[PDB]
Design a binder for this molecule. Structure first.
Ligand SMILES: [Cl-]
Length: 208
């Protein structure tokens, strides 16, 4: 008789409304982990973050964007305002581990560079300070119609992923704290991405 050979494997396009990934924020403690579902309908956002369907997936150049609730028992995104630059967001899929790091917040010029140099490559730091990512704030408040926040190159008119892009991860939630009038946006940039098969999970998980 014969047997299936099992391996870390996943569908190319996540099944609608199903969990296809898991995210961790070590700065928020080891217990902080949420499944990510495909889709951003009310039903999808019920048990945790949902992936915006037309955006990139984890580890991809472009923008991997998710929405999540802010209020409620076990809302995933109530404390995004407490993230600091270089804080890790770890994303697991069935085949891979990705580490994103929160981009510099509100700073510009020399201070932005120095902050970026804390966890990004010197090349990424330059792009963040003076290059294609100069305009991209790690956290800000915006209006519900701000659709370019989830564009492949955030807050631009570039929608198609391109090989020259960094990997971005975007988290969106309501704002202010007990309201849905506005939206909070957080951007983090990809610093690690590698396949499973082996016990090697990112060192970033041990932080905080
Ligand atoms: Cl409020």
């Amino acid at each position: 008789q014969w047997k299936e050979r099992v391996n870390p494997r996943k569908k190319l396009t996540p099944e609608l409304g199903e969990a296809f990934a898991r995210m961790y924020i070590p700065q928020f403690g080891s217990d902080f982990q949420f499944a990510i579902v495909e889709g951003t309908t009310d039903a999808d956002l019920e048990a945790g973050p949902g992936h915006y369907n037309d955006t990139q997936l984890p580890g991809e150049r472009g923008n991997f964007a998710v929405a999540g609730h802010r209020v409620g028992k076990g809302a995933p995104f109530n404390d995004l305002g407490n993230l600091n630059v270089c804080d890790a967001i770890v994303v697991e899929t069935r085949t891979s581990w990705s580490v994103y790091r929160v981009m510099p917040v509100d700073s510009s010029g020399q201070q932005r560079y120095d902050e970026a140099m804390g966890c990004f490559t010197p090349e990424q730091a330059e792009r963040i300070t003076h290059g294609d990512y100069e305009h991209v704030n790690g956290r800000f408040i915006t209006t519900p119609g701000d659709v370019s926040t989830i564009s492949a190159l955030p807050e631009t008119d570039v929608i198609e992923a391109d090989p020259g892009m960094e990997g971005i991860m975007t988290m969106t939630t309501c704002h202010p704290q007990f309201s849905n009038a506005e939206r909070m946006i957080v951007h983090a940039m990809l610093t690690e991405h590698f396949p499973k098969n082996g016990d090697n999970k990112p060192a970033a998980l041990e932080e905080g």
